[PDB]
Amino acid sequence: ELDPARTAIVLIEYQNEFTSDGGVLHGAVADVMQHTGMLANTVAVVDAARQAGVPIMHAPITFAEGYGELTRHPYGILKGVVDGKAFVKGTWGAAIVDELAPVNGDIVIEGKRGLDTFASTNLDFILRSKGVDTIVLGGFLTNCCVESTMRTGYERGFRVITLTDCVAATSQEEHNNAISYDFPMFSVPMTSADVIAALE
Amino acid sequence: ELDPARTAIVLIEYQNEFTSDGGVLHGAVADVMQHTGMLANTVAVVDAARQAGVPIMHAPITFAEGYGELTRHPYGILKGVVDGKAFVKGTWGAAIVDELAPVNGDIVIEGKRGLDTFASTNLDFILRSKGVDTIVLGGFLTNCCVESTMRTGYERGFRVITLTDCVAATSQEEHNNAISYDFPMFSVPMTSADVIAALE
Amino acid sequence: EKLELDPARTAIVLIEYQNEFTSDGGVLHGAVADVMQHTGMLANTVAVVDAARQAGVPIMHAPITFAEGYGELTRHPYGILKGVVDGKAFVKGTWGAAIVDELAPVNGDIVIEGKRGLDTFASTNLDFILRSKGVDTIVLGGFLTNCCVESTMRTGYERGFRVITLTDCVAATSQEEHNNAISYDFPMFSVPMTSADVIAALE
Amino acid sequence: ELDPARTAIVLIEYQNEFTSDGGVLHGAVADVMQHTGMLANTVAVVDAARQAGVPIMHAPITFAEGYGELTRHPYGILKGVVDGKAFVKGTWGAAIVDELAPVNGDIVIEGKRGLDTFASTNLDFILRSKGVDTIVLGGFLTNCCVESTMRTGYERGFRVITLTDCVAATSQEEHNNAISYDFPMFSVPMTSADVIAALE
């Protein structure tokens, strides 16, 4: 049961870096993108969201070239972002995949530098200003940025819905476990089809 | 490598509800508590930290009886807390287990009502006020409250050490998944022995 | 132009109505006495609370307290918290730290926890509880007009709440500081109202 | 005393819309800009900061055209921003004034939609990741965005230094009152000259 005036689709990091052949991180997520069909499922969800008047918010991650916005000695996941030169601002890799290119009305969330969309962006501000209380999440990575964003969403009292087949990760094991164990603690897990049915 | 003036031990939810026979949530965490020896490892870490002069911070979760500080219609993990009448303020369940009772000058973090300790407490305020930039995390649940806290601490630029043998969860597979896949993303995973050696 | 309040989406938030400010012998009471007296804030808050209960509106208290010795703060504070520390104000488990009797929390009132700074949103469970309960309108009162009350208003605003400031239920250490905050700052971040206006909206 | 490896200059809204003839809101701040000399003092501060190796971080405020990122029924100060059609993204007004144009190395904080730079941007994340514990603040508006940013900075444990002659408001009275009464509660106020000596 969805209220379009009080709902948003939040698309996390559908960027060529992940989504597209030649992306620095594409090879690592290919298998799961294939098994899930997340890309086409995401396209379908967005289409039904445009029609129902539900805003699309894209949340890309980017970094000024040289990574000066971060510690010179990162640890954990962002270390990989630095060493691999992923998501440099203004590059093909940082661009949102052509199939989901932002179009009239859509909101591109700004500032993302870490994994939790709510920790370095204007997402919370915009969601709250627009009176949105239900967020629908899709994107990358299932057990990293989608999971962090979902957990903070819950903390902040949104109704979080996670699109269990519009997410993808670097391994099927990591992907499946996130969805089976953690998603139910912090969200309402649903398929594109049921979200699509709910949007209509 | 640890600097005592700039380190905190953050002990999450060592409360009877989880730790003790009769706790509403004890049966769920019992197998993993026993498999890992978490209580005994935690007592060893805390003993060493006090010796080192490292402040010990307790982060209990509590709820005004009746759950009127929450939605009347919870979903996700907090639905079980309310439905199971867990962590009521002033009950034996809410009390910190006797083996880790706060002594002289220990800090007790106030406010927790959700999973991420940073989301509803004075933890950030106090760490920053004291100049703490490294946090050593232990407690319950591995894949819920510990992981949320770990994720937010990473986003806020803390050096987060996770005690791989001072945490527990409602299943062994869940516990193992978190430590193997997610902990390395947002923390420096360490055994208690490693942290003990670092503290001396 | 006339104010509508929905009881299910509304919360009175009372900042630091503790002896330390409100009552004779409180360490900071001398500094706020003139403005308390000028405004009649204490009685006015009582009348707004009473009406709030009658309409079923959550009353939320936001006291500030510190573990004795101030070991939860930097040893070398600056700014307004340096005065708290140096003055030994709001020590946990003292009369000064208690909420004032006239506004003692009764059955069902929420007592916000964690407060150690000035902004009520920065070190407590306030945001969590409001959002969990579905509150999107907070009515604000207490101390200090240009400090903690203003900080909470600013952040409230940033976080999408409809903030209402009770112009005659707040006080500061100076009438001049008080009046300036109310006339200049409050309208940028809030809808300032009187106790009487709020009470009428509640009924 | 200032450690360059632990300090950043944060410049709020040095955008043509305030600073320059033709800017929608320039008329309302011209008087105080003139009386303080804020623009030239800031250039001097930024130049000294560059020499010293201290990172420069500009925080512009922008909105996607049509103000759809916000409530359709704003109140308070943002209502004036929307009705005035100010700070529209990609327009000349939204651009940083030429004298303070970002130059190789400078960071441009992203996402600002509200008044407090901390509440809708990647400022905290970037400050904490780079290890900055002292922020030097200048810009617009003295009683609004500068005061909100300073209040939140202090809450978060930063040493906030406020440049009393590198800020401006719409009213001289409000400008002086904020500096006299509120700035001392939440910052160490200093003149540009005194900050430049410390930077030098």
Residues in A closer than 8 angstroms to C132, CB to CB, are 157
Residue D26 in tokens: 């320039």
Size of interface B-D (CB pairs under 8 A): 17
- Burial class, C85, CB count within 10 angstroms (exposed 0-12 / middle 13-18 / buried 19+): middle
Which candidate in C136, C180, C190, C193 is best for mutational testing of the D interface (most D CBs within 10 A)? C180
Is the CB of D124 inside 8 Å of chain B's CB atoms?
A: yes
Three-state DSSP string of B120-184: CCCHHHHHHHCCCCEEEEEEECHHHHHHHHHHHHHHCCCEEEEEEEEEECCCHHHHHHHHHHHHH
Q: Are strands D159-168 and D134-140 parallel, antiparallel or unpaired?
A: parallel
Residues in D closer than 8 angstroms to A121, CB to CB, are 111, 120-122
Is the CB of D69 inside 8 Å of chain A's CB atoms?
A: yes
Q: How far is A69 from chain B (nearest CA, A)?
A: 12
Residue A114: which of D71, D109, D125 has the nearest Cβ? D125
Residues in A closer than 8 angstroms to C11, CB to CB, are none
Please give the backbone phi and psi of residue A164, each rounded to the nearest 5 degrees, phi first.
-65, -20
Q: How far is A125 from chain C (nearest CA, A)?
A: 6
For tokens 């905190």, the residue is: B8
Torsion of CA B27, B33, B34, B39, to 10 degrees: -130
Residue A151: which of B75, B115, B187 has the nearest Cβ? B115
Q: Chain D: residue nearest A121 by CA?
A: D121
Size of interface C-D (CB pairs under 8 A): 77
Residue D69: which of A71, A74, A129 has the nearest Cβ? A129
CA distance linking residue C5 with residue C200, whole number of Å: 10
Residues 6+ apart with CB under 8 A from B187: A76, B137, B150, B153, B154, B160, B161, B162
Please give the backbone phi and psi of residue D109, each rounded to the nearest 5 degrees, phi first.
-55, 135
Residue C103 in tokens: 């506004």
Look at phi and psi of residue C58 and say left if phi exceeds 0, alpha if psi is from -120 to 50, else beta.
beta
Question: With an 8 Å Cβ cutoff, are D107 and A131 in contact?
Answer: no
| Per-residue DSSP letter, B72 | S
CA distance linking residue A107 with residue A100, whole number of Å: 12
Please give the backbone phi and psi of residue B126, each rounded to the nearest 5 degrees, phi first.
-75, -45
Count the Cβ atoms, other than its own, within 10 Å of residue D147.
Answer: 29
- Domains, chain C, ordered by start: 1-203 (3.40.50.850)
Q: Is the peptide bond before B2 cis (omega within 30 degrees of 0)?
A: no
Resolution in A: 2.3
Three-state DSSP string of chain D: CCCHHHEEEEEECCEHHHHCCCCCCHHHHHHHHHHHCHHHHHHHHHHHHHHHCCCEEEECCCECCCCCCCCCCCCCHHHHHHHCCCCECCCCCCCECHHHCCCCCCEECCCCCCCCCCCCCCHHHHHHHHCCCEEEEEEECCCCHHHHHHHHHHHCCCEEEEEEEEEECCCHHHHHHHHHHHHHHHCEEECHHHHHHHHC
Nearest-CA neighbor of A168 among A142, A138, A149, A191?
A142
- Edge to edge, the sheet with strand B107-108 lists B107-108, B56-59, B7-12, B134-140, B159-168, B188-190
Q: Chain A: residue nearest B120 by CA?
A: A155
Residues 6+ apart with CB under 8 A from D173: C184
CA distance linking residue A14 with residue A100, whole number of Å: 8
Q: How far is B119 from chain D (nearest CA, A)?
A: 14
Q: How far is B177 from chain A (nearest CA, A)?
A: 7
Count the Cβ atoms, other than its own, within 10 Å of residue B66.
Answer: 11
Look at phi and psi of residue B132 and say left if phi exceeds 0, alpha if psi is from -120 to 50, else beta.
beta
| Per-residue DSSP letter, C57 | P
Please give the backbone phi and psi of residue C143, each rounded to the nearest 5 degrees, phi first.
-130, 150
Question: With an 8 Å Cβ cutoff, are C154 and D156 in contact?
Answer: no
Cα-based angle B36, B37, B38 (whole degrees, multiple of 5)? 90
Residues 6+ apart with CB under 8 A from B103: B50
Which candidate in D73, D110, D127 is best for mutational testing of the A interface (most A CBs within 10 A)? D110
Nearest-CA neighbor of A14 among A141, A170, A136?
A141
Residues in D closer than 8 angstroms to B124, CB to CB, are 156
Residues in B closer than 8 angstroms to C71, CB to CB, are 105, 107
Residues in C closer than 8 angstroms to A155, CB to CB, are 128
Is the CB of B174 inside 8 Å of chain A's CB atoms?
A: yes
Question: With an 8 Å Cβ cutoff, are B125 and C110 in contact?
Answer: no
Q: Are strands D188-190 and C191-193 parallel, antiparallel or unpaired?
A: unpaired
Reported in sequence order, the residue ranges of chain C that DSSP labels E, i.e. its strands, are: 10-15, 59-62, 110-111, 137-143, 162-171, 191-193
D150, D176 contact by CB (below 8 A): no
- Burial class, B104, CB count within 10 angstroms (exposed 0-12 / middle 13-18 / buried 19+): exposed
Which candidate in C155, C191, C193 is best for mutational testing of the D interface (most D CBs within 10 A)? C155
Which candidate in A69, A108, A121 is best for mutational testing of the D interface (most D CBs within 10 A)? A69
Residue B108 in tokens: 């007790």
Measured between its terminal Cα atoms, the distance across chain D in Å is 10
Give, for A12, the enclosing helix (H) or strand (E): strand A7-12
Residues in A closer than 8 angstroms to B187, CB to CB, are 76
Look at phi and psi of residue A98 and say left if phi exceeds 0, alpha if psi is from -120 to 50, else beta.
alpha
Is the CB of A102 inside 8 Å of chain D's CB atoms?
A: no
Question: With an 8 Å Cβ cutoff, are A152 and B116 in contact?
Answer: yes
Give, for A200, the enclosing helix (H) or strand (E): none
Residue D128: which of B125, B129, B156 has the nearest Cβ? B156
Is the CB of D28 inside 8 Å of chain C's CB atoms?
A: no
Is the CB of C134 inside 8 Å of chain B's CB atoms?
A: yes
**3-state secondary structure (DSSP) of residue C25:** coil
List b or e across C22-52, with b for residues whose CB sees 16 or more CB atoms inside 10 angstroms. Answer: bbeebbbbebbbebbeebebbebbbebbebb
Side chain identity at residue A52, one-letter code:
A
Q: Chain D: residue nearest A111 by CA?
A: D110
Residues in B closer than 8 angstroms to C110, CB to CB, are 64, 68-69
**3-state secondary structure (DSSP) of residue A126:** helix
For tokens 């938030």, the residue is: C13
